[PDB]
Amino acid sequence: GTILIDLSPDDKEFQSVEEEMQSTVREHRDGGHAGGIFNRYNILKIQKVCNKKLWERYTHRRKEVSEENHNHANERMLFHGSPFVNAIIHKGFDERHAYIGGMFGAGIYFAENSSKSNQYVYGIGGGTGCPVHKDRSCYICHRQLLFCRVTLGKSFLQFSAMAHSPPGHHSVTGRPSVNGLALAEYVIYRGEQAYPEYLITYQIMRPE
Ligand SMILES: COc1cccc2c(=O)[nH]c(-c3ccc(Cl)cc3)cc12
Ligand SMILES: [Zn+2]
């Protein structure tokens, strides 16, 4: 039941999603090993993901969380990078999209930094890179990220350098505690707590 609607670049919605993508790029502590070397992206396409069943699944769970947290869903817009983008947009998030080995346990991981999610497009640690050239820093091959609506509810704060949420909590927040430029990362343990709202097609750009 999924349909994808192209946004025109003249559309304010295209422009505000592109700006969130571009403005949350940072340098990474691997020097670009996992995700490539770049300071900005070439945005090729932005599509709205429309699936009524998956949306109602999201809003149902959002209401449950909100009612457990003084009518506050604590909803964010966050990036997700994955080799399974194309299954996610058709079937929704579930246990098969969890990062089993993540530092906050087996859950589904999201980032404020678009460049963090970019490290996972070709797999954990960037895998072996693009399928065509085996290059984690490929400037040619098209990449895709999701920009997702995520319900955090009461989030457990972890200060730092499928499983269950900590008791009394609906998510985990990974707060950066060394790299002063890093933005937060978040983990949910229920696939229903996220909706893949935008599919973004891009390339990383080689710095001049
Ligand atoms: C530190 O983890 C993360 C931190 C921040 C963001 C992400 C992210 O966007 N995706 C992923 C990810 C996706 C698919 C698999 Cl199979 C594994 C991991 C991780 C991840
Ligand atoms: Zn390539």
List the one residue out of 186, 190, 142, 143 whose CA is nearest residue 164. Answer: 190
CB burial of 19-29 (b: ≥16 within 10 Å; e: otherwise) equals ebbeebbeebe
Question: Which residues make beta-bridge pairs with 147?
Answer: 79, 198
**Token digits of residue 148:** 């997702």
Resolution stated for this PDB structure, in Å = 2.0
Domains and CATH numbers, the chain: 1-208 (3.90.228.10)
Q: What is the DSSP letter of 195?
A: E
Residue type, 36: G
List the one residue out of 73, 43, 26 whose CA is nearest residue 198. Answer: 43
Sign of the dihedral defined by the CA atoms of residues 71, 77, 83, 87, in that order: positive
148 is in an annotated binding site: no
Atom of ligand 1 nearest to the CA of 79: 9
Q: Are 153 and 68 in contact (CB under 8 A)?
A: yes
How far is the CA of 204 from the CAs of 42, 131, 182, in angstroms? Answer: 6, 15, 19
What span, in angstroms and rounded, lies between the C-alpha atoms of 165 and 107? 9
CA of 194 relative to ligand 2 center, distance in Å: 30
Instruction: Note the ligand closest to the C-alpha atom of 36.
Output: 2
138 is in an annotated binding site: yes
Cβ(165) to ligand 1 under 6 A? Answer: no
Place of tokens 């750009």: 205
Instruction: Note the ligand closest to the C-alpha atom of 131.
Output: 2
33 is in an annotated binding site: no
What span, in angstroms and rounded, lies between the C-alpha atoms of 31 and 37? 7
Residue type, 124: I
Break sites following residues in the chain (C–N > 2.5 A): 161
Total Cβ atoms within 10 A of residue 154? 16
Q: Are 42 and 9 in contact (CB under 8 A)?
A: no
Residues 6+ apart with CB under 8 A from 171: 151, 152, 153, 154, 155, 156, 165, 186, 187, 188, 189, 193
CA of 30 relative to ligand 2 center, distance in Å: 20
Q: Are 149 and 194 in contact (CB under 8 A)?
A: yes
Sign of the dihedral defined by the CA atoms of residues 119, 124, 125, 127, in that order: negative
What span, in angstroms and rounded, lies between the C-alpha atoms of 110 and 128? 21
What span, in angstroms and rounded, lies between the C-alpha atoms of 189 and 151? 11
Rg (the chain; Cα; Å): 17
What span, in angstroms and rounded, lies between the C-alpha atoms of 197 and 192? 13
3-class SS string, 30-70 = CCCCCCCCCCCEEEEEEEEEECHHHHHHHHHHHHHHHHCCC
List the one residue out of 91, 98, 94 whose CA is nearest residue 120. Answer: 98
CA of 78 relative to ligand 2 center, distance in Å: 26
Helix (H) / strand (E) containing 16:
helix 12-23
How many residues would you count in the chain? 208
What span, in angstroms and rounded, lies between the C-alpha atoms of 78 and 116? 11
CA of 102 relative to ligand 1 center, distance in Å: 8
3-class SS string, 112-167 = CCHHHHHCCCCCHHHCCCCCCCCCCCCCCCCEEEEEEEEECCCEEEEEECCCCCCC
List the one residue out of 203, 164, 161 whose CA is nearest residue 182. Answer: 161
Instruction: Note the ligand closest to the C-alpha atom of 142.
Output: 2
> Solving technique for this entry?
X-ray
What span, in angstroms and rounded, lies between the C-alpha atoms of 97 and 23? 26
